[PDB]
């Protein structure tokens, strides 16, 4: 049944409507702002023990 809700899923237009300490982590995870790739940009590695931090490969 396309228009009718089958199981718990109902589809209208382009939007879909469905019926529905670890909890603290999930909410903390939900509230993250920076993307990993954006956090990825900031991080530098040391190639050697006393070498400079190299961020992006040339």
């Amino acid at each position: 049944a396309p228009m009718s809700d089958v199981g718990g899923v109902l589809m209208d237009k382009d939007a879909v409507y469905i019926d529905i300490e670890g909890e603290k982590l999930m909410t903390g995870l939900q509230s993250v702002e920076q993307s990993i790739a954006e956090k990825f940009d900031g991080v530098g590695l040391q190639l050697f023990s006393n070498g400079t931090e190299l961020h992006e490969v040339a």
Binding site: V32, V57, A58
Partner: protein, 852 residues
């Protein structure tokens, strides 16, 4: 009625429209309940998608059973008890009931390789291993969806620490699990990976953060429909080309048809492709084409007939396209051998003229003299000498997999091409047949597993010249840093696996796990002299095996599962039963990799030499924070070495490697009689003792091995050339030279001992042939004993021979070869070989007279 965030549907529709895949990482105990809703969204997007679902699990299913009768009984009991209503099913139960779900254990992933599924589900994240990620992801259909259920509680903390900071890694109370901690961060990089909770809310760790719905709707299909339409009238090409799924796959068939039309029996056609690109479909169609063309004796060879089930299946489909009809036009013969599991061995075809397709084992190349066409499927898995024998005066079709199954290193394919440079025709299949080209997930899977990594020639070395060996310096690679994705690390990681894959014969996908999680393994790199990412020249993988690993093993038995094994201590223990060797701490060089272009320049030998110095002490916390990154490489002086008693190597015995280890002062201790099926090559363990530590036991092992090798040379090592056998003998004899002690020494033959082994009647025969009063066949009984004493050194200093003559005497005595056989191997005339031998025993006859 809670609206999903618009990102989840848009990604699904975008993937279906673009025929691109998508990953979903569901975190939560109710993760299973979302899967029915996700699947409804796929079928709603497009009804043409495959409805079969792949379920993968380790041992147990999450709260349900795959048996239909067990559930309905449980349902019926629940209804009878009144716990559940008569007709009330939850969506999750309805999902499993109606759809086609295939339940597969992680161990048995070989079964799912062929089948096509619309959707793949991975139950357990902790048990994820690289082959299971390469294998299962490839079995989805384009526009399909992969779901990983991150339900384990400990993983959720691992997720949390990554999101709060990329630097610190959560670590529980010896397996460190970097690959799984490495598995998470790449999912963020992927544009088509979305991580979601059990309430269908988007976690921001995902790369798919800015996904937007694409407008409603490919060039490759246009180039394919036009090609098929143009060839419809041209049978048998039209019907067979119609079976083609991609532009490149059709071209491969056409090139095969051209080879079939040319009728030249000195022609070899090479197909190189990745797994899942449709090679076996291409070969099966062409075999139907040759069979329609008029070829009578068609041959097929592969490591096992079972792998050919796909190839035969597409032959029958090409047969169906060409009007071939079963039990009228052709007959199918299945194997009677239980090992082959009723695999198709022969197909007999009868219209026009009697034509036969038959399977032949790669070893049996003699029957191929009458062959008009041989198709070698998965030539990468067949030994190089055997495929050479399979290149006879007939049409050859060869298919080799690059990064598929175990396959082979890319350079090995290149070496084969260089040998072919017989006319050579090369065909490459790059377009996949299962999904849209350039899918992010395949690129994601390749970067994670580094399957597609390629070695690159660096101009910088050429401008500055090759570094002289003494200038280079070995550096310890910190594994924590290497598997962290800092973008310099990956390019450094890729360069290592680029050298890793190319050099040695066979490398499994699960290897990328092995050096990652296992503690005993350590990485060493022969970096160029420092003066940009440093580019490796030689990489060594060590495994610490001995008393050191016992503590880890005892911990391993405590949890209830034993991990890995100490191969050398077990190998040495079973053969000789020396308790002390197991106690001795030692290291095994799992693999030494050098650039094939820069081979023979001594980079590998020096790395072993500098490695030997480091563990000898001649050069005398970097762990990550456990819930800023330490240096990628660590100098030898900076980390103390562990106390070791020996350095061990295990490798397939070949002349080049044996000389390489022979020059590095290693001593052989064991050789496997049973040749490895994939290589046809005998595994050898060869050992070196460091200075300042006892060396007697190596000498005792070497002496036993020589008596081992001499006697066993007849059983299964007759195939080895006489020269190769001598090098094994001499390398062990170097071990005696290592020991300056005279406590153990050979004994000279006594007169009483001589009388027992040979009667006086024999000594008359020994004398007469020297006088030339006998035929050689009479003294045949004497030869094997004569070889044992000489290589056993019973005659001593008095009798000595040349390397060529030792090869001759070694072989008739112990390889057991006939003299004329020796003539070919040594490139000597048969008469000269006999004349040289007659001189050998004249010395020996003179020697026995002297003692008498």
């Amino acid at each position: 009625k809670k609206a999903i965030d618009s990102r989840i549907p848009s990604l699904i529709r975008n993937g279906v429209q673009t025929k691109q895949r998508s990953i979903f990482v569901i975190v939560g105990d109710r993760a299973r309940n979302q899967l029915p809703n996700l699947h409804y969204l796929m079928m709603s997007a497009d009804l043409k998608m495959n409805k079969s679902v792949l379920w993968a699990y380790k041992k147990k299913l999450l709260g349900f059973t795959s048996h239909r009768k067990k559930r309905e009984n449980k349902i019926k009991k629940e209804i009878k008890r009144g716990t559940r209503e008569v007709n009330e099913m939850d969506p999750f139960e309805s999902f499993i009931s109606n759809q086609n779900i295939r339940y597969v254990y992680y161990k048995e992933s070989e079964k799912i390789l062929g089948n096509t599924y619309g959707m793949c589900i991975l139950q357990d994240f902790e048990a994820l291993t690289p082959n299971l990620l390469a294998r299962t992801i490839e079995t989805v259909e384009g526009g399909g969806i992969v779901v990983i259920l991150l339900k384990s509680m400990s993983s959720l903390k691992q997720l949390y620490t990554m999101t709060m900071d990329v630097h610190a890694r959560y670590r529980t109370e010896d397996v460190v699990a970097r690959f799984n901690e490495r598995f998470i961060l790449s999912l963020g990089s992927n544009p088509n990976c979305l991580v979601v909770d059990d309430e269908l809310n988007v976690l921001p760790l995902s790369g798919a953060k800015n996904v937007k719905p694409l407008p409603p709707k490919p060039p490759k299909q246009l180039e394919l429909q036009e090609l098929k339409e143009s060839l419809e009238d041209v049978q048998p090409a039209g019907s067979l080309v119609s079976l083609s799924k991609t532009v490149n796959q059709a071209h491969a068939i056409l090139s095969f048809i051209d080879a079939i039309s040319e009728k030249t029996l000195n022609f070899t056609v090479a197909l190189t492709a990745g797994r899942g690109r449709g090679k076996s479909a291409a070969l099966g169609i062409s075999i139907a084409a040759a069979v329609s063309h008029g070829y009578s004796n068609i041959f097929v060879t592969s490591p096992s007939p079972e792998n050919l089930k796909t190839l035969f299946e597409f032959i029958f489909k090409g047969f169906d396209a060409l009007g071939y009809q079963e039990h009228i036009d052709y007959d199918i013969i299945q194997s009677t051998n239980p090992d082959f599991n009723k695999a198709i061995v022969r197909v007999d075809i009868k219209r026009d003229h009697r034509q036969t397709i038959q399977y032949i084992v790669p070893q049996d190349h003699q029957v191929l003299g009458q062959a008009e066409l041989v198709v070698i499927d998965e030539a990468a898995a067949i030994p190089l000498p055997i495929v050479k024998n399979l290149l006879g005066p007939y049409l050859v079709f060869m298919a080799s997999t690059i990064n598929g199954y175990e396959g082979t290193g890319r350079s090995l394919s290149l070496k084969l091409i260089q040998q072919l440079r017989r006319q050579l025709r090369e065909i490459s299949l790059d377009e996949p047949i299962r999904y849209a080209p350039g899918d992010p997930i395949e690129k994601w899977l390749n970067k994670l597993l580094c399957l597609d990594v390629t070695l690159i020639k660096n101009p910088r070395f050429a401008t500055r010249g090759t570094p002289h060996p003494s200038q280079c310096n070995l550096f310890v690679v910190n594994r924590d840093t290497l598997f962290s994705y800092h973008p310099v690390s990956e390019n450094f990681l890729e360069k290592m696996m680029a050298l890793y894959v190319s050099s040695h014969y066979k490398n499994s996908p699960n290897d990328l796990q092995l050096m990652s999680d296992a503690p005993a393994h350590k990485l060493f790199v022969l970096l160029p002299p420092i003066d940009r990412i440093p580019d490796p020249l030689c990489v060594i993988q060590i495994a610490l095996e001995g008393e050191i690993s016992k503590e880890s093993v005892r911990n391993s038995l405590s949890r209830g599962q034993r991990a890995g094994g100490d191969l050398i201590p077990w190998l040495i223990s079973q053969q000789f039963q020396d308790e002390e060797f197991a106690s001795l701490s030692g290291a095994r060089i799992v693999r030494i990799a050098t650039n094939p272009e820069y081979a023979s320049m001594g980079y590998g030998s020096r790395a072993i030499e500098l490695l030997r110095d480091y563990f000898e002490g001649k050069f005398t916390d970097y762990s990550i924070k456990r819930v800023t990154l330490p240096p990628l490489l660590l100098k030898l002086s900076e980390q103390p070495p562990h106390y070791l008693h020996y350095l061990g190597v295990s490798y397939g015995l070949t002349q080049s490697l044996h000389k390489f280890w022979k020059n590095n002062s290693f001593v052989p201790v064991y050789l496997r009689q049973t040749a490895n099926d994939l290589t046809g090559e005998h595994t050898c363990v060869m050992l070196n003792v460091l200075e300042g530590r006892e060396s007697n036991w190596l000498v005792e092992f070497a002496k036993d091995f020589r008596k081992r090798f001499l006697s066993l040379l007849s059983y299964d090592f007759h195939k080895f050339t006489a020269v190769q056998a001598l090098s094994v003998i001499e390398s062990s004899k170097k071990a005696q030279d290592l020991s300056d002690d005279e406590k153990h020494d050979n004994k000279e033959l006594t007169r009483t001992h001589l009388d027992d082994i040979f009667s006086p009647f024999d000594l008359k025969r020994l004398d007469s042939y020297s006088n030339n009063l006998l035929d050689y066949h009479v003294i045949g009984d004497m030869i094997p004993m004569l070889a044992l004493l000489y290589f056993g050194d019973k005659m001593g200093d008095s009798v000595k021979l040349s390397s060529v003559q030792s090869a001759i005497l070694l072989a008739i005595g112990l390889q057991r070869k006939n003299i004329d056989t020796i003539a070919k191997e040594l490139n000597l005339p048969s008469n000269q070989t006999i004349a040289m031998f007659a001189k050998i025993m004249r010395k020996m006859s003179q020697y026995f007279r002297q003692l008498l």
